[PDB]
Symmetry: C2
């Protein structure tokens, strides 16, 4: 049961929710899901740029307490997903 | 395209594999690392209440920092935490 493939698939699932969530579309619960990921992994986007734009534009999605500049130092959620499945946290 | 159920099952399966390897083989340092990371991240210590208990007993260092053995009987197991993640319940 391959590690890299599942990791890719989680990243994809996240990305899906994120695309649905930034729109305030929630027909598949994407908002709660993105919020759950972001709080669990302490990230706010599929990349630095994305985290930062999501924080600027959809600030309610980011980890509570975190400010916007922090998305330039933190790891993005794809990185954190990789850490989860590779064992670095 | 990714279905929620399937990826959650796949993640659970992956977690189970790592947990088994991590508990019975003390040199599978990659499995241990992963297991430990799942555990700290999701705040749980097994596939189920019982396996969380046996994990806390055989390799307690795999459990979340400052967690206690008896609490594994009252806490959500990692399967339920993984479902919570993909389902949207923090």
């Amino acid at each position: 049961v391959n590690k890299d493939q599942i990791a890719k698939d989680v990243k994809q699932f996240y990305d899906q929710a994120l695309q649905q969530a930034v729109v305030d579309d929630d027909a598949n619960n994407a908002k709660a899901v993105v919020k759950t990921f972001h709080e669990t992994l302490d990230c706010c986007g599929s990349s630095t740029l994305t985290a930062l734009t999501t924080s600027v534009l959809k600030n309610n999605l980011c980890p509570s307490g975190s400010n916007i500049i922090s998305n330039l130092f933190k790891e993005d959620c794809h990185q954190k997903i990789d850490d989860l499945f590779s064992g670095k946290g």
